[PDB]
Design a protein around this ligand. Structure first.
Ligand SMILES: Nc1nc2c(ncn2[C@@H]2O[C@H](COP(=O)(O)OP(=O)(O)CP(=O)(O)O)[C@@H](O)[C@H]2O)c(=O)[nH]1
Ligand code: NA
Ligand code: NA
Ligand code: NA
Length: 413
């Protein structure tokens, strides 16, 4: 029997609307992440999450030898496959109005799959925008998956293949592989598993770093395999980006609970202890980077699920983490509005304007109070928890009623 371990790597799945991201995750994991019959009142808005084990049948033909279940009967072997690792997928919504959600999920990714529909002109707006965001944030362990190849001839697929290679030529993604599949009919998925093992290696983890977990609200993610057992108290979900946490460790939620004392709005950190640690349906004594973890606490559930709880990160109780209402950012602007149907030119940052800041897994609006050539200073509508000095931020500006990614930078403390 394969061992029960936590997922050790997060693979993002991004791409233009309806290109088949959720169906590809289902092809790999067997899990349909988005309740898709109807949603709220015309797309999925939450992140999708699913996990799978990955194995390989030793004396069997590749790529068919790679498996996602402990069986080798498909290749004539009577042995169990060799367990390789457990992986997880962060499924981001494709709609252009939901870019903040993609950026929030991109903070959790160790690698990424860019889904490109073979029956659509390349590149579509969010194909370009999700690709640029990946390079901006540093998720450069990328596989480009040519989905829906069942719809088109081998000629048309190869034609689009050459377009993608020319698009990536001269960029950081020049050597990125392109793997054609049919997610819906599960064709050539084995070559994608092989590509994942070859191009999305599990990253080195510095397990001595100060433990930091980026929180994902329960209402912002669909994780069918994970469940909130809250007999001991509220459960907080998210992903560990550095260090490790253990059961019985004293922790704090930052910035914390909104409090208005005499008309003064502040955020009080919430302290608790880790009652339990869960990945999917299994309990663990420790939690490392990789996978969506469920941190069981002793807090009352009405607190952990409250909208007034600005729970952006979790750290150890005695960790030093500034919570800033004002931040300075060494920024860089793009050359063009990438996610629009027509690529506008981006105007420079001007004082007194409102910008959207993606920091870790949170999004915050703020007022520019100082503009320089390579630095800005922002008055934040809500504080952000800054656990390090080299923290990436993505800058967005509202254009035509839609927030569009215009630049990036580093939060300087
Ligand atoms: N013919 C064919 N259709 C596919 C394939 N993969 C997905 N589709 C179809 O495309 C449609 C959208 O697929 P879905 O996986 O939901 O796309 P999505 O990208 O997750 C939608 P969103 O961008 O809102 O997240 C569905 O009808 C699905 O059946 C494929 O490999 N071949
Ligand atoms: Na599986
Ligand atoms: Na990362
Ligand atoms: Na084809």
């Amino acid at each position: 029997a394969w061992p029960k371990v936590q997922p050790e790597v997060n693979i993002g799945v991004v791409g233009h609307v309806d290109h088949g991201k959720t169906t590809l995750v289902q092809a790999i994991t067997g899990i349909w992440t988005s309740k898709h019959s109807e949603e709220l009142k015309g797309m999925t808005i939450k992140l999708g999450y699913a996990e799978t084990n990955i194995g390989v049948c030793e004396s069997c033909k590749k790529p068919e030898a790679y498996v996602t279940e402990p069986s080798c009967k498909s290749c004539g072997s009577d042995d169990e496959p060799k367990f390789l690792r457990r992986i997880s997928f962060i499924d981001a919504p494709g709609h252009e109005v939901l870019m903040a959600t993609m950026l929030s999920g991109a903070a959790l990714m160790d690698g990424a799959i860019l889904v490109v529909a073979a029956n659509e002109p390349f590149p579509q707006p969010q194909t370009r925008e999700h690709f640029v965001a990946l390079g901006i944030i540093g998720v450069k362990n990328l596989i480009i998956v040519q989905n829906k190849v069942d719809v088109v001839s081998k000629e048309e697929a190869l034609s689009q293949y050459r377009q993608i290679k020319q698009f990536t030529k001269g960029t950081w993604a020049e050597n990125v592989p392109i793997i054609p599949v049919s997610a819906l009919h599960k064709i050539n998925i084995d070559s994608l598993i092989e590509g994942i093992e070859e191009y999305i290696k599990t990253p080195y983890r510095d397990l001595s770093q100060k433990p930091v977990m980026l929180v994902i609200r329960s209402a912002d993610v669909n994780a069918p395999g994970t469940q909130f057992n809250e007999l001991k108290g509220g459960v907080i979900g998210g992903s560990i980006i550095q260090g490790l946490f253990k059961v019985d460790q004293e922790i704090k939620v930052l910035p914390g609970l909104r409090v208005e004392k005499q008309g003064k709005v502040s955020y009080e950190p919430i302290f608790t202890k880790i009652s339990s640690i869960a990945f999917g349906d299994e309990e663990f004594k420790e939690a490392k980077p990789g996978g969506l973890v469920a941190i069981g606490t002793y807090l009352d559930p009405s607190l952990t699920k409250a909208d007034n709880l600005l729970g952006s990160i979790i750290t150890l109780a005695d960790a030093e983490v500034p919570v800033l209402w004002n931040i300075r950012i060494k920024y860089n602007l793009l050359e063009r509005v990438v996610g629009a149907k027509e690529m506008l030119k981006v105007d420079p940052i001007r004082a007194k304007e409102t910008l959207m800041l993606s920091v870790g897994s949170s999004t915050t609006l703020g007022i520019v109070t100082s503009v320089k050539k390579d630095e800005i200073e922002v008055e934040l509508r809500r504080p952000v928890a800054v656990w390090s000095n080299n923290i990436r931020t993505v800058i967005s500006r509202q254009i035509a009623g839609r927030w569009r990614m215009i630049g990036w930078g580093l939060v300087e403390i």
